[PDB]
Design an enzyme around this catalytic site. Structure first.
Site, PDB file in Angstrom:
ATOM      1  N   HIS C  53       0.866  -1.184   0.000  1.00 47.94           N
ATOM      2  CA  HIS C  53       0.000   0.000   0.000  1.00 47.94           C
ATOM      3  C   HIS C  53       0.888   1.214   0.000  1.00 47.94           C
ATOM      4  O   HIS C  53       1.958   1.213   0.638  1.00 47.94           O
ATOM      5  CB  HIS C  53      -0.874   0.110   1.257  1.00 47.94           C
ATOM      6  CG  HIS C  53      -1.783  -1.035   1.531  1.00 47.94           C
ATOM      7  ND1 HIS C  53      -1.348  -2.203   2.146  1.00 47.94           N
ATOM      8  CD2 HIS C  53      -3.093  -1.243   1.275  1.00 47.94           C
ATOM      9  CE1 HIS C  53      -2.368  -3.038   2.215  1.00 47.94           C
ATOM     10  NE2 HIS C  53      -3.464  -2.509   1.708  1.00 47.94           N
ATOM     11  N   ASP C  56       2.243   1.916   3.425  1.00 47.70           N
ATOM     12  CA  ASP C  56       3.246   0.993   3.956  1.00 47.70           C
ATOM     13  C   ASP C  56       4.646   1.401   3.544  1.00 47.70           C
ATOM     14  O   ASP C  56       5.608   1.156   4.250  1.00 47.70           O
ATOM     15  CB  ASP C  56       3.046  -0.410   3.358  1.00 47.70           C
ATOM     16  CG  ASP C  56       1.740  -1.108   3.629  1.00 47.70           C
ATOM     17  OD1 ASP C  56       1.091  -0.874   4.679  1.00 47.70           O
ATOM     18  OD2 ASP C  56       1.367  -1.920   2.758  1.00 47.70           O
ATOM     19  N   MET C  87       2.547  -5.734  -8.138  1.00 49.54           N
ATOM     20  CA  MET C  87       1.232  -5.224  -7.756  1.00 49.54           C
ATOM     21  C   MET C  87       1.480  -4.176  -6.668  1.00 49.54           C
ATOM     22  O   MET C  87       2.373  -4.279  -5.867  1.00 49.54           O
ATOM     23  CB  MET C  87       0.368  -6.374  -7.252  1.00 49.54           C
ATOM     24  CG  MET C  87      -1.033  -6.000  -6.766  1.00 49.54           C
ATOM     25  SD  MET C  87      -1.136  -5.365  -5.085  1.00 49.54           S
ATOM     26  CE  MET C  87      -1.293  -6.886  -4.180  1.00 49.54           C
ATOM     27  N   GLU C 180     -10.884  -6.405  -5.127  1.00 54.58           N
ATOM     28  CA  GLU C 180     -10.823  -7.441  -4.118  1.00 54.58           C
ATOM     29  C   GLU C 180     -12.102  -7.481  -3.305  1.00 54.58           C
ATOM     30  O   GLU C 180     -12.336  -6.567  -2.492  1.00 54.58           O
ATOM     31  CB  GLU C 180      -9.630  -7.203  -3.199  1.00 54.58           C
ATOM     32  CG  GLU C 180      -9.461  -8.314  -2.167  1.00 54.58           C
ATOM     33  CD  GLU C 180      -8.125  -8.277  -1.482  1.00 54.58           C
ATOM     34  OE1 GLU C 180      -7.238  -7.514  -1.939  1.00 54.58           O
ATOM     35  OE2 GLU C 180      -7.960  -9.034  -0.483  1.00 54.58           O
ATOM     36  N   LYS C 182     -14.678  -8.776  -0.299  1.00 60.03           N
ATOM     37  CA  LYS C 182     -14.621  -9.297   1.045  1.00 60.03           C
ATOM     38  C   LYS C 182     -16.026  -9.161   1.626  1.00 60.03           C
ATOM     39  O   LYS C 182     -16.664  -8.144   1.372  1.00 60.03           O
ATOM     40  CB  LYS C 182     -13.652  -8.512   1.919  1.00 60.03           C
ATOM     41  CG  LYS C 182     -13.342  -9.145   3.260  1.00 60.03           C
ATOM     42  CD  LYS C 182     -12.359  -8.300   4.091  1.00 60.03           C
ATOM     43  CE  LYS C 182     -11.907  -8.984   5.328  1.00 60.03           C
ATOM     44  NZ  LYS C 182     -10.994  -8.109   6.097  1.00 60.03           N
ATOM     45  N   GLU C 216      -9.320 -13.394  -2.492  1.00 53.74           N
ATOM     46  CA  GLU C 216      -8.511 -13.865  -1.395  1.00 53.74           C
ATOM     47  C   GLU C 216      -9.144 -15.113  -0.782  1.00 53.74           C
ATOM     48  O   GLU C 216     -10.346 -15.116  -0.481  1.00 53.74           O
ATOM     49  CB  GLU C 216      -8.355 -12.784  -0.300  1.00 53.74           C
ATOM     50  CG  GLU C 216      -7.546 -13.280   0.902  1.00 53.74           C
ATOM     51  CD  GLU C 216      -7.157 -12.201   1.863  1.00 53.74           C
ATOM     52  OE1 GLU C 216      -6.558 -11.214   1.425  1.00 53.74           O
ATOM     53  OE2 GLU C 216      -7.453 -12.386   3.074  1.00 53.74           O
ATOM     54  N   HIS C 219     -11.246 -14.579   2.342  1.00 55.81           N
ATOM     55  CA  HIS C 219     -12.422 -13.716   2.179  1.00 55.81           C
ATOM     56  C   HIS C 219     -13.633 -14.540   1.709  1.00 55.81           C
ATOM     57  O   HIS C 219     -14.715 -14.427   2.254  1.00 55.81           O
ATOM     58  CB  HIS C 219     -12.162 -12.607   1.220  1.00 55.81           C
ATOM     59  CG  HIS C 219     -11.181 -11.588   1.766  1.00 55.81           C
ATOM     60  ND1 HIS C 219     -10.907 -10.449   1.046  1.00 55.81           N
ATOM     61  CD2 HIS C 219     -10.433 -11.576   2.874  1.00 55.81           C
ATOM     62  CE1 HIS C 219      -9.982  -9.790   1.737  1.00 55.81           C
ATOM     63  NE2 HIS C 219      -9.693 -10.410   2.846  1.00 55.81           N
ATOM     64  N   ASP C 244      -4.826 -13.488  -3.880  1.00 58.46           N
ATOM     65  CA  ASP C 244      -4.286 -13.417  -2.532  1.00 58.46           C
ATOM     66  C   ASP C 244      -4.448 -14.772  -1.866  1.00 58.46           C
ATOM     67  O   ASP C 244      -5.579 -15.285  -1.699  1.00 58.46           O
ATOM     68  CB  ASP C 244      -4.982 -12.360  -1.689  1.00 58.46           C
ATOM     69  CG  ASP C 244      -4.567 -10.942  -1.927  1.00 58.46           C
ATOM     70  OD1 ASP C 244      -3.664 -10.667  -2.753  1.00 58.46           O
ATOM     71  OD2 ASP C 244      -5.158 -10.048  -1.257  1.00 58.46           O
ATOM     72  N   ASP C 254     -11.375 -12.287   9.801  1.00 57.60           N
ATOM     73  CA  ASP C 254     -10.328 -12.556   8.799  1.00 57.60           C
ATOM     74  C   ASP C 254      -9.053 -12.921   9.514  1.00 57.60           C
ATOM     75  O   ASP C 254      -8.435 -12.100  10.199  1.00 57.60           O
ATOM     76  CB  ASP C 254     -10.150 -11.293   7.971  1.00 57.60           C
ATOM     77  CG  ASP C 254      -9.342 -11.330   6.694  1.00 57.60           C
ATOM     78  OD1 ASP C 254      -9.214 -12.423   6.097  1.00 57.60           O
ATOM     79  OD2 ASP C 254      -8.865 -10.232   6.299  1.00 57.60           O
ATOM     80  N   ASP C 256      -6.114 -14.580   8.138  1.00 57.14           N
ATOM     81  CA  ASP C 256      -4.859 -14.406   7.400  1.00 57.14           C
ATOM     82  C   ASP C 256      -3.792 -15.393   7.865  1.00 57.14           C
ATOM     83  O   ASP C 256      -2.611 -15.059   8.036  1.00 57.14           O
ATOM     84  CB  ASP C 256      -4.395 -12.971   7.462  1.00 57.14           C
ATOM     85  CG  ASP C 256      -5.302 -12.016   6.726  1.00 57.14           C
ATOM     86  OD1 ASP C 256      -6.026 -12.378   5.825  1.00 57.14           O
ATOM     87  OD2 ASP C 256      -5.360 -10.842   7.142  1.00 57.14           O
ATOM     88  N   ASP C 286      -1.221 -12.815   1.057  1.00 64.04           N
ATOM     89  CA  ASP C 286      -1.765 -11.773   1.926  1.00 64.04           C
ATOM     90  C   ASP C 286      -2.094 -12.443   3.225  1.00 64.04           C
ATOM     91  O   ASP C 286      -3.194 -12.993   3.372  1.00 64.04           O
ATOM     92  CB  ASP C 286      -2.944 -11.076   1.319  1.00 64.04           C
ATOM     93  CG  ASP C 286      -3.388  -9.890   2.118  1.00 64.04           C
ATOM     94  OD1 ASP C 286      -2.775  -9.617   3.169  1.00 64.04           O
ATOM     95  OD2 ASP C 286      -4.317  -9.170   1.657  1.00 64.04           O
TER      96      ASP C 286
HETATM   97  O1  LIG Z   1      -8.680  -7.875   4.518  1.00 65.26           O
HETATM   98  C1  LIG Z   1      -7.623  -7.007   4.083  1.00 65.26           C
HETATM   99  C2  LIG Z   1      -7.313  -7.139   2.612  1.00 65.26           C
HETATM  100  O2  LIG Z   1      -7.076  -8.533   2.333  1.00 65.26           O
HETATM  101  C3  LIG Z   1      -6.181  -6.270   2.153  1.00 65.26           C
HETATM  102  O3  LIG Z   1      -4.916  -6.678   2.691  1.00 65.26           O
HETATM  103  C4  LIG Z   1      -6.103  -6.067   0.661  1.00 65.26           C
HETATM  104  O4  LIG Z   1      -5.651  -7.244  -0.021  1.00 65.26           O
HETATM  105  C5  LIG Z   1      -5.182  -4.938   0.238  1.00 65.26           C
HETATM  106  O5  LIG Z   1      -5.636  -3.699   0.784  1.00 65.26           O
HETATM  107 MN   LIG Z   2      -6.111  -9.407   0.502  1.00 62.09          MN
HETATM  108 MN   LIG Z   3      -7.844 -11.320   4.707  1.00 59.17          MN
HETATM  109 NA    NA Z   4       9.838   3.040   3.802  1.00 68.52          NA
HETATM  110  O   LIG Z   5      -5.936  -9.882   4.413  1.00 60.98           O
END
Ligand SMILES: OC[C@@H](O)[C@H](O)[C@@H](O)CO
Ligand SMILES: [Mn+2]
Ligand SMILES: [Mn+2]
Ligand code: NA
Ligand SMILES: [O-]
Ligand SMILES: OC[C@@H](O)[C@H](O)[C@@H](O)CO
Ligand SMILES: OC[C@@H](O)[C@H](O)[C@@H](O)CO
Ligand SMILES: OC[C@@H](O)[C@H](O)[C@@H](O)CO
Ligand SMILES: [Mn+2]
Ligand SMILES: [Mn+2]
Ligand SMILES: [Mn+2]
Ligand SMILES: [Mn+2]
Ligand SMILES: [Mn+2]
Ligand SMILES: [Mn+2]
Ligand code: NA
Ligand code: NA
Ligand code: NA
Ligand code: NA
Ligand code: NA
Ligand code: NA
Ligand code: NA
Ligand SMILES: [O-]
Ligand SMILES: [O-]
Ligand SMILES: [O-]
Lengths: 386, 386, 386, 386
Positions: C53, C56, C87, C180, C182, C216, C219, C244, C254, C256, C286
């Site tokens: 991002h 980031d 990306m 994306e 979700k 993702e 998601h 993702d 979520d 991850d 991700d």
């Molecule tokens: O749930 C959060 C999302 O997965 C993000 O990390 C997107 O992939 C990018 O903003």
């Molecule tokens: Mn994601």
């Molecule tokens: Mn996620």
């Molecule tokens: Na930096």
């Molecule tokens: O995520």
């Protein structure tokens, strides 16, 4: 490899492989199976035994003569094959009379009938050797809020299980009950929806020692719960009297996939737990070969239940035996979890400045748990990628 | 209309209205609130009292002087307003030291620290008048299977709660514990994930009378469970020591919507149950004004919690009072559910041919339960469409 | 074995391994990572590239000088290691200004700001080589029903994506967008909650060719959906522009988890599908190393993502290559699924008595699908039990 | 009050009130209903019309004579009552031949049969006046990963719908198709699992104008989705050709509760949306009176569907009409959501320093959305507590 034998204690309900494939939207895809055929085919596949509802073994409404004939042929098949009957149960859900419940039906006459139907089959279960009598109260519950006063329903449930306990005590029978929770389906919400609720309920019965749980993989997963964790709590309580093994693909209708299907990693952790705990009971599959399958697929799916248990058993044992895993468990302080927190007692703890006043929370916080390395060793073992 | 007053026993955590709006993907949207401001604003809105974690009232790491100052100003605000403190709790989840748990952390030194942190705040809770001490073990659990041996973790959990019980017994304190289940979040799976699991666990403690549950609406709904049913089981067990009221829009992250939001019909049935059971405890809101809101929205959302309880209370009382509903309940045999099934005992039941041999299952089956008419009366009452 | 190299196209977000461990109930457990350190460590582990991002890579609110410095050091690390940036994306969710959305915020001035923030980072993404620009509208949605008029919000969403398409067209840039979906979190419900909703929305944009999906794993699983099936629909539509990869333990917040964790069988079927389809894009993780972990656990978890993909790739290829599986696929009529149903057209079909009048439905019905044998071959291959 | 009349466009499937009560664990609790009886009873209750599957109106396998007789008596009942038939559909799910699908069955001969069965009933639907032909592909999907190649299945699905479109085009018929998504049940996962997936699929058909969606309240809720939001996306796309109204108590088996039951607030927001959008189509109930009910309960439950729609319609209209709500909507910037973000275009936006360089993000962030006050007005209106 992975060939089951009776030593492995695998059992199946008559209603599992015998499911004709009717679903909420579908007519039967397979013919009814003779229980004799089922006993013979399961014996050939390496099963240890078979379980039944009353009405799977003897058609509902049978005359006394007809009943005796169905029992006789079943006993002869069991006797011929050396198949056992470690568990039986009552069907308190199919007949329309049970539309609002068996033991917690609002109609008193139905509650009494449910108890009589159960008691009749307890007597048969005992003769056939069952040491556990399952009760799955699938019709106990509601679709709407005023239909069922749950406190009063629990009073009726307790009354019913207490009488059953008085009956088996007065008969001198050896048999114990195993209550099977389920969150929903076929009622909108079922009473005693999880392992925890069932465990809690048992502690209010008159003779709690006579009652344990019969958890089912898919049922706890219909609440999104961790089945291994729930089994651990049941084992911790001394209440894992029986278990129903299958698969479930998340929070949805009860699928009854073969064991290993659905949440494979949960199946692995379940086998790991049962084997390290020394669970002694039957390895019972309460599953349905999908209605896509013909009879050859039925037996393939049943064989797959057993095969997957045995693969997972091998992988879990390899995981625990691996010195690299034993080291990772130490790195993650699983050994230290087993140390009493404060065997030294309250006054010592309160006087111990290393527990509070002089405890360096930041140095403790900075210490990683190393759980990811541990879990990747577990993944590698499951996948045979070691 | 629907104006709360202290008589109504509504309480709020400091951390509820004081939530700054940080979420997994978001920075704070509101400034920190002074606990004094919160006491004054809630008193003005008609609340009865306020609850706290240790670290909401006294910033973590405060010196003894600083601690005493934060307590003093809070006590003066309570004293000025007549606000009470019926419950308090410990924060065993925010600080990184608790990343693997408090009472069930794998590191023994962390477990001991958790106990000391708890005991310190028990003493403060008692001085301020709390009669219930909540324990929400939000970090007790795992993301992976070998990270936590759940049987051993339950041993540590029991050890911890047993020592706390020994401490309050030795001090002569009046206070009782209320264990708060939650299925997940912030751990992948949390130990004691539902009301049932918590109830069951309590029955293995040394002094079970000192422990009950603090169920939260949204938590049980994160497992897709029926919150009113779970409350009924807790009441049946005599263990509803406290309750957390909020809203939740299904199976997802813990939303902490204001009470009445989320599953509105479940909120109605909950109020119906609490009022008919004569629950005596605080009507505590564990909710978060959404981070979309400014401070005026915070107070509007808090007021809405109370307003919705009071609307639902009126509707539920009207429902139960309606002669048409009393008749529908009879038509549905809710009266008959309260009759003992077999007070007459086992031998009578077994000799009673009307219970089996001569029971007309088809005539019983044909009798509709009339639950839809009953439930539509309930809908009409909820909606004010009567 | 299973050693990743840049050839394998594995990529990671800066925010993945760089997650400090803050959660809804928890403070950070790890220090911030310098993006330079992340590029070097991921290169050493065998990654192909890194994603970001805006905020980031460059702290929010940086001066132009500061911005240029953060970019310069990052470019030098990329250049030194040969790490790529396939990306990038915009953070339209963390800052409190985005509390009601970016492109669909109710405040018009916020919508305009979101677009400017995005456009600035598109320019940077293009310079660094990104061919896909992800948009995750995590704040687009609502907690309550009247807060967001969804038809109007979709108008604003379309307007925003259409302008972005006009901008990249006018600049001559090569880059494509990947939306994306979700279902929820951090909003109660998010707009475009699944792959399907995003695919459908794209078809109403002015220049649909410029837009695809970035699905993702976790998601879609937060809606209980089958991630491989959704990827198949995206591939069928020609819209799988990026993906993702991670793990998720069912319907909950979520999580991850690292790829392979969570639903392991779904991970297997996903890899099977990506490899047979010839997906060309990055294999982007991700994920979040759990906050239990220290920095060594961060890198172990990242390595585990890649290792699991490579194990699954091997197993899936072995499955498809096995003559026994090729035969089982024929037994299950997967070959016949690829035959056109009625290439012969409507009139032929209507005149064909073998399709209706003379079709033996019972003989067709009796033919088992043999799916259980097929699936047990797949299980055996996954587990290395062949 | 709240008395339905044909003007209100309420319709019911024959299979709704005619459900005999068979469930996965239960035999029928009610006798089959004659479609003539259903037409008469629904007309008396104030319905506008009735819908059918082929095999609800004409028993499967009927001879041509028998078929004509069932149609004739139905037409006479419709003609006598003035009941209409606005929609019909095909049963491609009950017969065992459809165990792996209709249009996406792996067996080609089954796919062809499914198309012929559909075409036959399209002709009948058109004669009876249906303007929408629903397709619910309940058997399209899988329980296991290799059983169904989803890309190829989508090819077959498209082929099938394209031929149906060629057929109705060549016949000159007026009728449009409405594809009904569902996430699961009776397949483990169903293809086109949500509104979004169905909308996306339609855009790849040859003649997309002939196809829309038939979303069902409970189906989207089986994925935990926001049904009003999904309806808004369907309306935004111009694809809400029909709708199925019912209730669902969360993520579980398809319950088909009467409309208003289940998620009551979602029912309110749905009615609000349909009425403000001017949806013109039938208000169709796809529900099941619970099997607890006798025939009197069947009609009570059907009446309750209509009553609840009408109550909610009144409440939603009162909400929108209230000046206090119109002000709250402005306070929450719902008016501003309707302003184009950047009608002024890309170059203006890029040159506008008020959009970026000089945008005060903190002052914008500090502005509360006032959504809680708005939502409490909505709650008050729903509950009649105004
Ligand atoms: O749930 C959060 C999302 O997965 C993000 O990390 C997107 O992939 C990018 O903003
Ligand atoms: Mn994601
Ligand atoms: Mn996620
Ligand atoms: Na930096
Ligand atoms: O995520
Ligand atoms: O969901 C159905 C249940 O699992 C039953 O099969 C019980 O185990 C036995 O009645
Ligand atoms: O999910 C968070 C919990 O609900 C807590 O707020 C407890 O009630 C108190 O620690
Ligand atoms: O879940 C079942 C479906 O809702 C069907 O009733 C379709 O609407 C028509 O076949
Ligand atoms: Mn089951
Ligand atoms: Mn079972
Ligand atoms: Mn909560
Ligand atoms: Mn709480
Ligand atoms: Mn349905
Ligand atoms: Mn439907
Ligand atoms: Na028999
Ligand atoms: Na007892
Ligand atoms: Na303070
Ligand atoms: Na104790
Ligand atoms: Na465009
Ligand atoms: Na008929
Ligand atoms: Na077409
Ligand atoms: O089952
Ligand atoms: O909470
Ligand atoms: O349905």
């Amino acid at each position: 490899s992975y060939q089951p034998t009776p030593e492995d204690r695998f059992t199946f309900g008559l209603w599992t492989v015998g499911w004709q494939g009717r679903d909420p939207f579908g007519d039967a895809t397979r013919p009814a199976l003779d229980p004799v055929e089922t006993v013979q085919r399961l014996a050939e596949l390496g099963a240890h035994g078979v379980t039944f509802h009353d009405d799977d073994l003897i058609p509902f409404g049978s005359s006394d003569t007809e009943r005796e004939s169905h029992i006789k042929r079943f006993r002869q098949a069991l006797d011929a094959t050396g198949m056992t009957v470690p568990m039986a149960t009552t069907n308190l859900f199919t007949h329309p009379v049970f539309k609002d419940g068996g033991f917690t039906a609002n109609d008193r006459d139905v509650r009494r009938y449910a108890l009589r139907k159960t008691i009749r089959n307890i007597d048969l279960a005992v003769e056939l050797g069952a040491k556990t009598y399952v009760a799955w109260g699938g019709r106990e519950g509601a679709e709407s809020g005023a239909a069922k006063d749950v406190r009063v329903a629990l009073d009726r449930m307790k009354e019913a299980f207490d009488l059953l306990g008085e009956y088996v005590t007065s008969q001198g029978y050896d048999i114990r009950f195993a209550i099977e929770p389920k969150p929903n389906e076929p009622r909108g919400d079922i009473l005693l929806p999880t392992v925890g609720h069932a465990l809690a309920f048992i502690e209010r019965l008159e003779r709690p020692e006579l009652y344990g749980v019969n958890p089912e993989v898919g049922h706890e997963q219909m609440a999104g719960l961790n089945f291994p964790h729930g089994i651990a709590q049941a084992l911790w309580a001394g209440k894992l009297f029986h278990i129903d093994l299958n698969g479930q693909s998340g929070i949805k209708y009860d699928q009854d996939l073969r064991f290993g299907a659905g949440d494979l990693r949960a199946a692995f952790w379940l086998v790991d737990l049962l084997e390290s705990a020394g669970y002694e009971g039957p390895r019972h599959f309460d599953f349905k070969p999908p209605r896509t399958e013909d009879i050859d697929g039925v037996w393939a799916s049943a064989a797959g239940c057993m095969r997957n248990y045995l693969i997972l058993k091998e992988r879990a044992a390899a995981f625990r035996a691996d010195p690299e895993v034993q080291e990772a468990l130490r790195a993650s302080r699983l050994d230290e979890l087993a140390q009493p927190t404060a065997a030294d007692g309250v006054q010592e703890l309160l006087a111990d400045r290393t527990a509070f006043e002089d405890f360096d929370v930041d140095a403790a916080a900075a210490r990683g748990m190393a759980f990811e390395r541990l879990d990747q060793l577990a993944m590698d073992h499951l996948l045979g990628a070691r």
